[PDB]
Amino acid sequence: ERDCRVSSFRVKENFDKARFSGTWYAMAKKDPEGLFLQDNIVAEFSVDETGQMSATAKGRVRLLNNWDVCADMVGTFTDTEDPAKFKMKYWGVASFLQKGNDDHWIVDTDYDTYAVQYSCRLLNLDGTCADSYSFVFSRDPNGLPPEAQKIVRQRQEELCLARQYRLIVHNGYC
Numbered sequence: 657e658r659d660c661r662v663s664s665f666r667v668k669e670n671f672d673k674a675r676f677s678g679t680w681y682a683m684a685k686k687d688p689e690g691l692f693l694q695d696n697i698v699a700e701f702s703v704d705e706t707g708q709m710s711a712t713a714k715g716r717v718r719l720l721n722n723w724d725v726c727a728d729m730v731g732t733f734t735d736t737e738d739p740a741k742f743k744m745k746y747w748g749v750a751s752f753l754q755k756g757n758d759d760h761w762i763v764d765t766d767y768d769t770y771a772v773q774y775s776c777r778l779l780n781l782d783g784t785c786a787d788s789y790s791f792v793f794s795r796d797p798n799g800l801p802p803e804a805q806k807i808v809r810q811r812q813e814e815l816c817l818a819r820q821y822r823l824i825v826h827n828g829y830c
C-alpha cells in the first residue's frame with residue numbers, strides 16, 4: 657500500500673526546538689553509504705536567543721583499517737518552510753573528521769522519550785531514497801518504554817526502513 661517516496665514521508669507537525677533541546681541517546685541506526693558513526697552515539701541539541709538550533713554529537717567511528725576514534729561533531733541547523741525539516745551543516749572539531757550538509761528531518765518525537773530522525777542524502781529517479789540514514793533517539797540511555805518503542809517501530813515502517821536498523825551500543829567508549 658504505502659509509498660516509499662521521500663516527499664510522502666510525514667514529519668513532526670508543529671515541531672518545537674526548545675522542547676527538543678537536551679541530551680539524546682542513539683538506540684538504533686540505519687547507516688548510510690560509506691563512513692558513519694558506529695556506536696556509543698550521544699547527541700546534545702541546543703537552540704539560541706535567535707531560534708537557531710544546533711548540536712554536538714559523539715561516537716565511535718572506525719576510521720580505515722581499525723583505527724577507532726571517538727569523534728566529536730558539530731552540526732548547525734538551518735530552518736526550512738517545514739518546521740520539522742532542516743538543513744544540517746556539520747563538521748568535526750578536528751579538521752580531518754568528516755564535514756558535510758545533510759537534510760535532517762524530525763519524523764516524530766515526543767520531546768520527553770523518543771525521537772525518530774531521517775535523512776535522505778540521495779534520491780532515486782523514482783522519488784524514493786537512494787541513500788538515507790535514520791536515528792532512533794532515546795532520552796534514557798537504557799532504551800524506550802514499550803509504548804514508545806511501539807510507535808517508533810511504526811515509524812521505522814512508514815520510512816520503508818524497518819528491519820534495516822541496528823542496535824547501537826553505549827559501552828563506555830567515548
Ligand SMILES: CC1=C(/C=C/C(C)=C/C=C/C(C)=C/CO)C(C)(C)CCC1
Pocket residue numbers: 691692693699711712713717727729730731732746747752753754791
Ligand atoms: C551533526 C550530528 C549528526 C550527524 C553526525 C555525523 C553524520 C557524524 C559523522 C561522523 C563521521 C562519520 C566521522 C568520521 O570521520 C547527528 C545526526 C547524530 C545528530 C546531530 C549531530
